[PDB]
Amino acid sequence: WQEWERKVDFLEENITALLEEAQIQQEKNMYELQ
Amino acid sequence: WQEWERKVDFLEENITALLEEAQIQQEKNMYELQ
Amino acid sequence: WQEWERKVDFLEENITALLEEAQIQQEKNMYELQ
Amino acid sequence: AGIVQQQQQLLDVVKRQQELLRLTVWGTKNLQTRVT
Amino acid sequence: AGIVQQQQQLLDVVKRQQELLRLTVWGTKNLQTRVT
Amino acid sequence: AGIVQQQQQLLDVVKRQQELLRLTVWGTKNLQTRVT
């Protein structure tokens, strides 16, 4: 459970950052489709 | 736990909504290339 | 909990497989669109 | 045709992840009922 | 457009799925604390 | 080719989520065994 906790915490921090980039890239797709 | 539940119950309904509408916008894009 | 467990195990394996397939299409897209 | 095709596969996996998410919330709700 | 749109809808689901996942990890943590 | 990369990122996200999800499920199962 000790290892589990730091793995889920990182995975959470990871996906959050990834979710930002995913949005930013999305912001560029329609910003640049034309 | 009271607000917790209230939240996961709203998220569930939300996601099912997005998934539903996504299936729609998906089939629209399918018959469109056509 | 008996059935529950049987379904999470299956779904976990199923999703990991669907993801792998998406990898094949992702590749064709990397190729084609380029 | 290939981007949309991937979109169907992407939406297909996200649907199943939800089924799995629902199952985990059920367990959590269930354990919660008892532990409480 | 219609697909760059489907791209957003997909991003929204995962965004929402993460919101739900967070809460579920919070529940697991809470129960784990009391159960032990 | 703007969307293809974005489709890879969304792919990587669902993958990270699946990993986190599997971990969450292990916790749900583990608690379950302790409770019963």
UniProtKB/TrEMBL annotation, chains A, B, C:
<protein>
    <recommendedName>
        <fullName>Env polyprotein</fullName>
    </recommendedName>
</protein>
<feature type="coiled-coil region">
    <location>
        <begin position="1"/>
        <end position="28"/>
    </location>
</feature>
